[PDB]
Design a protein around this ligand. Structure first.
Ligand SMILES: Nc1ccn([C@H]2C[C@H](O)[C@@H](COP(=O)(O)NP(=O)(O)OP(=O)(O)O)O2)c(=O)n1
Ligand SMILES: [Mg+2]
Length: 378
DNA sequence: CTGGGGTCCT
DNA sequence: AGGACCC
């Protein structure tokens, strides 16, 4: 019952899209900027020392010749992302989205059909596509090895189809679960793929230097674990189950300790259509209810176009604010306005979000972030 | 000089 | 409503 999973991660996604829009940007060192942050950059700027999530001032110091493009509008990135996901859904219907640029696909059924169409004389002719992690030797008599190789071939066909149909490049990783497929996809970058045979799992899991490098272990869990002297993957592997059960609860403890061994039983979930739409806007300061009302109007209009095109009606609205630490107030959308989506649906919505806003803050302040979300879609 | 999004769990 | 995680 050993699965074959592929994880696809796009190379400098936003930068890649911006280079497609304006091929002029292809040669020069490019960075995509949101407010004071260079959120991603092309390979050239990366050679010049620019790194992801670097300060615009630090990136400009490291690279004064750097050219920046504003990427605070995720419209193009969202379109392209869902094009990638749909194309992968053409291979296997079960595709899971992670962020805008990552996709898990379960290739087990497909690999099975491909193998069952083959003849024994062709079984020795099975070859890997792309890198093999750790230069490990392929045993063509190992059925798991064969299935993983076929998975590598399917991954290659996926990347080639992404390039020929969408002009996008990315990295792929083929493994037996989602954690390992994601961990091995980034070994060779960019525009390469790597397959992980089982015998090398531990090697991969011990190539990490920080426990936060494990997907599923974030900032709070990492700092917490550090407070107990757990700093390496082997520390977490060998640590006492009961203590971290006490420190993190039973669920977090068991699951992340299983992750420390490369074990991940979670299935690939069909993402399908989005569960929510939302838009944000940060600022140095917000102190006027009129300006807050105007920003909320700006978010509302774009959200209305986005939801109108989707063809599903949201049944909950929420407002999020950040103080001088985030707070939110939501409520159902009236069926009167819900049914008539696409009339001046604006004015009542502004009234609703302004009432929630008053619940949050007293007009009778310093806000640094305003966000609006349509949730509970149908 | 720290964005703009998403998911699921409690 | 908030908090954990992901990009
Ligand atoms: N914290 C983050 C992480 C990613 N992103 C956006 C910018 C990225 O272009 C896109 C993909 O994220 P990413 O895979 O973490 N880095 P990117 O794809 O740019 O480069 P690679 O390292 O994957 O080649 O999401 C963001 O806006 N905020
Ligand atoms: Mg990427």
């Amino acid at each position: 019952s050993s699965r074959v999973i592929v994880h696809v991660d796009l190379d400098c996604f936003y930068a890649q899209v911006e280079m497609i829009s304006n091929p002029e940007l292809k040669d020069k060192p490019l960075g995509v900027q949101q407010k004071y942050l260079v959120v991603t950059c092309n390979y050239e700027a990366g050679k010049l020392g620019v790194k992801k999530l670097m300060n615009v001032r630090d990136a400009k110091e490291k690279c004064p010749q750097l050219v920046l493009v504003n990427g605070e509008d995720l419209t193009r990135y969202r379109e392209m992302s869902y094009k990638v996901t749909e194309l992968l859904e053409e291979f296997s219907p079960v595709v899971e989205r992670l962020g805008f640029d990552e996709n898990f696909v379960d290739l087990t059924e497909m690999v099975e059909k491909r193998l069952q169409q083959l003849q024994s004389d062709e079984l020795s002719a099975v070859t890997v596509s792309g890198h093999v992690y750790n230069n490990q030797s392929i045993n063509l008599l190992d059925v798991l090895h064969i299935r993983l190789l076929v998975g590598s071939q399917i991954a290659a066909e996926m990347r080639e189809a992404m390039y020929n149909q969408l002009g996008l490049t990315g990295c792929a990783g083929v493994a037996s679960n989602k954690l390992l497929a994601k961990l091995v996809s980034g070994v060779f970058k960019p525009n390469q793929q790597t397959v992980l045979l089982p015998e090398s799992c531990q090697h991969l899991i011990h190539s990490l230097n920080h426990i936060k490098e494990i997907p599923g272990i974030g900032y709070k869990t990492a700092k917490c674990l550090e407070a107990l002297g757990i700093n390496s993957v082997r520390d977490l592997q060998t640590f006492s189950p009961k203590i971290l059960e006490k420190e993190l609860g039973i669920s977090v403890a068991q699951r992340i300790q299983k992750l420390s061994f490369g074990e991940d039983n979670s299935p690939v979930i069909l993402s399908g259509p989005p569960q929510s739409f939302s838009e944000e806007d940060s600022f140095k300061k917000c102190s006027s209810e009129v300006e807050a009302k105007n920003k909320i109007e700006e978010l509302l209009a774009s959200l209305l176009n986005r939801v109108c095109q989707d063809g599903r009606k949201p049944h909950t609205v929420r407002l999020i604010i950040r103080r001088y630490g985030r707070e939110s107030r939501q409520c159902p959308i009236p069926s009167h306005v819900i049914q008539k989506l696409g009339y001046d649906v604006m004015t009542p919505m502004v009234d609703i979000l302004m009432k929630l806003f008053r619940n949050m803050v007293n007009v009778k302040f310093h806000l640094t972030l305003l966000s609006v979300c349509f949730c509970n879609l149908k």
